[PDB]
């Protein structure tokens, strides 16, 4: 069974986080204890609490009382509520359930508190330098800065055409002047560079995508 | 209070196979069921198998049925996770779990602090520099990025500065990726006015002392 | 021994096997927590013969510990075009189960354990034989026990064992004779048992006697933190080899090396314990369960 988060979610401090935890259609929320986790950088996932109803329902170990669960049937979807959001709740959130032999993890929400406000990204895409050509080797690379929240969707087309082998994408990193950056490489043979008319680099942030293109004729 | 502590980080060559270690203190193992659970950098978190004590059982996730075996030191409330054939994918952060609900008396740890496990075949090469020129494309109303591509190195780290470290506004570093040839790689890149291009210098230092490796390389616009 | 009796027999597990949200709980029953399909069988009013019998094992408990084998279909769905395996069999019963409950569980005529089963968010009817919507807040993680029984290992072969009954026809499946009067039927609290090699078997009478025994079923070690279970396999007979150390009651003492200050944990003698055996048309045997259940009957007149 495959347990569909949101990529990302954001609101500002002092409001109320809702994340979601939709369920296939052949199982039903309403039969399992939800595991709800928060997960920081460098740290392994913390129990937040679980949630399978008002009366069966435990918080974690230090957990405040913000941290909240509950669910929706006719969406299908286990619900983790944090009221009053604080700086300290920016971080990823995991939702699990355990209907047989298995631990099955949702894709995971990075949730961030909008410290201040929504930078779109700069996207700039390198096409491989005549040094590297000269190696026998090719390696596009997208730069994407400046932008918040940290989060991106980074997607490689060749000729119109998607491309999922030999890509490398990196996790959006704080800059300097505190927006995000991340980076994202193409790895291809010298020919493979050549033989299309032209590779893509598509980031989409916020639901907006922004596409750069290069081409070897030039 | 549970204390669960893992093993140092790894490096496994392609096929072998890698054991890691979950040591439990305040508590006794053959009171607690254990589980694995790992994360590929920067992805999601996976289950991979547990072992039922109620039950006396141990069950594995189909993905790795054949690779992931394991085992308990009894005497030492140790467990162990053994996964075999390893390949380029099984490059994870891999955590010993303990089921929060069944042991909420527990004010400890439920998750171990992780072990990493490296694939790659590789030993001690040194990074290949390439320039990341601006040409015109890289420009939107006065600013433009250049950087350098530090690509093929092996172990971690590196470390970039930009003229000789007197360049330090508008340069972003990225963290390294491990690619399926087992070599790392990263990028650093500056955003420049587009003006100064013609007027200022810019040269990445590269050092990687693992095989004292140090790299300049001038990074001017393209013809 | 009131607080004891969640100090089960064996494993102890009491959840159904498509059912494991309450394995916290249910997988062991011990002290600590509530388990839906356990704690039915305490309350007083309800099961008489498992409560006059309550240190041996229910029927989810003899299925986990391998003394009770699941149905072909372990589970039948009454919300399907016939829910076949186990509607005949059911209707011939005359249950009543509580609210909230998706799940309910039954010795078989074969003597092996079936399921009633529903939908993620039905009840069942109070009557267990159909499917009713949920109008509580959230269903029971548990299976709900339809007959009142106790359960036991035994190696007694009953494969010569069956239904004996005066003047009876019919009794819930099984049909004992060709009757051809016309004849008296009714819902009998019928008392039965199950058997090594045998089926289920119906009886005009309950006979059972106890051998009490001094062996280490026979019981209940705890350790106080606040009461948690202990296995009194790590505690050393009277001459022999311990990886604890424990004290007891004076039967416990009797058998076992006692230190009373050292202790690690208490057994008491679990008085109720030991090995039952059940008369079976004159013939004393080792019966693998015993119980009662609600069926119809039909006897000549």
Redesign the interface.
Same mark, same amino acid.
Do not use: G, I, V, W
């Given at each position: 069974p495959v347990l569909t988060q949101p990529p990302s979610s954001s609101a500002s401090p002092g409001e109320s986080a809702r994340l979601t935890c939709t369920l296939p259609s052949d199982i039903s929320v309403s039969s399992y204890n939800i595991y709800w986790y928060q997960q920081k950088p460098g740290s392994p996932p913390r129990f937040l609490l679980y949630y399978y109803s008002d009366s069966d329902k435990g918080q974690g170990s230090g957990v405040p009382s913000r941290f909240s669960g509950s669910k929706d049937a006719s969406d299908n979807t286990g619900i983790l509520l944090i009221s009053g959001l604080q700086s300290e709740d920016e971080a990823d959130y995991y939702c699990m359930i355990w209907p047989s032999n298995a631990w099955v993890f949702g894709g995971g929400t990075k949730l961030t508190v909008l410290g201040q406000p929504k930078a779109a990204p700069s996207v700039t895409l390198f096409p491989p330098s005549s040094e590297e050509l000269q190696a026998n080797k090719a390696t596009l690379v997208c730069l994407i800065s400046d932008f918040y929240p940290g989060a991106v969707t980074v997607a490689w087309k060749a000729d119109s055409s998607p491309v999922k082998a030999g890509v490398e994408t990196t996790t959006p990193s704080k800059q300097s002047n505190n927006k995000y950056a991340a980076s994202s490489y193409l790895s291809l043979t010298p020919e493979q560079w050549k033989s299309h008319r032209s590779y893509s680099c598509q980031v989409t942030h916020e639901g907006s995508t922004v596409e750069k293109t290069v081409a070897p004729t030039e | 209070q549970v204390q669960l502590v893992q093993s140092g980080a790894e490096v496994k060559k392609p096929g072998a196979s890698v054991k890691v270690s979950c040591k439990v203190s305040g508590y006794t193992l053959t009171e607690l069921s254990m589980h694995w659970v790992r994360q590929a950098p920067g992805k999601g978190l996976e289950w991979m198998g547990g072992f039922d004590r109620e039950d006396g059982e141990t069950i594995y996730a189909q993905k790795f049925q054949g690779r992931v075996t394991m085992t308990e030191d009894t005497s030492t409330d140790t467990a162990y996770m053994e996964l075999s054939s390893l390949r380029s994918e099984d490059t994870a952060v891999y955590y010993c779990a303990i089921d929060p609900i069944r042991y909420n008396w527990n004010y400890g740890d439920y998750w171990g602090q992780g072990t990493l496990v490296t694939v790659s075949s590789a030993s001690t090469k040194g990074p290949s520099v390439f320039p990341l020129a601006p040409s015109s494309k890289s420009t939107s109303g006065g600013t433009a990025a250049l950087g350098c591509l530090v690509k093929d190195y092996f172990p971690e780290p590196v470390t970039v500065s930009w003229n000789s470290g007197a360049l330090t506004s508008g340069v972003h570093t990225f963290p390294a990726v491990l690619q399926s040839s087992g070599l790392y790689s990263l990028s650093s890149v500056v955003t420049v006015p587009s003006s100064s291009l013609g007027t200022q210098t810019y040269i990445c230092n590269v050092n990687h002392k693992p095989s004292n490796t140090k790299v300049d390389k001038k990074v001017e616009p393209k013809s | 021994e009131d607080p004891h009796l969640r100090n089960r027999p064996g %494993?102890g597990?009491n959840y159904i096997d498509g059912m494991?949200?309450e394995?916290?709980t249910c +997988? #062991?029953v011990t002290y600590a927590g509530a388990c839906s399909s356990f704690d039915v069988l305490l309350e007083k009013g309800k099961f008489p013969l498992f409560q006059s019998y309550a240190h041996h094992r229910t029927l989810l408990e003899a299925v986990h510990d391998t003394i009770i084998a699941k149905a072909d279909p372990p589970s039948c769905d009454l919300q399907s075009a016939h829910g076949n395996p186990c509607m005949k069999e059911k209707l011939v019963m005359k249950t009543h189960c509580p609210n909230d409950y998706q799940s309910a569980h039954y010795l078989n005529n074969d003597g092996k354990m079936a399921s009633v089963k529903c #939908? #993620? %968010?039905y009840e069942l009817t109070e009557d267990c034989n159909f499917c009713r919507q949920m109008t509580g807040?959230?269903?029971k +993680?548990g299976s709900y026990p339809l007959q009142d029984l106790f359960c036991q290992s035994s190696e007694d072969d009953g494969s010569k064992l069956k239904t004996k009954m005066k003047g009876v026809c019919e009794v819930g499946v099984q049909a004992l004779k060709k009757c051809d009067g016309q004849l008296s039927t009714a819902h009998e609290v019928v008392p039965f048992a199950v058997f090594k090699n045998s089926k289920k078997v119906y009886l005009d009478k309950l006979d059972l006697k106890t051998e009490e025994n001094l062996l280490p079923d026979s019981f209940v070690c705890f350790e106080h933190k606040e009461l948690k279970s202990f296995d009194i396999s790590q505690c050393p007979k009277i001459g022999g080899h311990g990886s604890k150390k424990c004290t007891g009651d004076a039967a416990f003492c009797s058998a076992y090396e006692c230190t009373a200050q050292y202790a690690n944990a208490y057994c008491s003698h679990a008085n109720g314990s030991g090995i039952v055996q059940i008369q079976v048309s004159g013939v004393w045997k080792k019966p693998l369960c015993v119980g009662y259940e609600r069926v119809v009957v039909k006897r000549e007149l």
């Open positions: - | - | %494993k597990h494991t949200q394995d916290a +997988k #062991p #939908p #993620p %968010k807040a959230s269903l +993680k």
